[PDB]
């Protein structure tokens, strides 16, 4: 079970993936 992520996790309400929004808990569009 693993949906495509654009980047890291939005832990601490923080997303660090440039160009990708957050979809807690993962940075995905």
UniProtKB/Swiss-Prot annotation:
Keywords: Disulfide bond, Knottin, Plant defense. InterPro entries: Cyclotide, Cyclotide_moebius_CS, Cyclotide_sf. This is a cyclic peptide. One of its GO terms (biological process) is defense response. Disulfide bonds join 6-20, 10-22, 15-27. Transmembrane segments: none annotated. It holds the Pfam family Cyclotide. This is Kalata-B4. It comes from Oldenlandia affinis. The presence of a 'disulfide through disulfide knot' structurally defines this protein as a knottin. Probably participates in a plant defense mechanism. Belongs to the cyclotide family. Moebius subfamily. It comes from the Eukaryota. Signal peptide: none annotated.
């Amino acid at each position: 079970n693993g949906l495509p992520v654009c980047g890291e996790t939005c832990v601490g309400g923080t997303c660090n993936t440039p160009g990708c929004k957050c979809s807690w808990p993962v940075c995905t569009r």
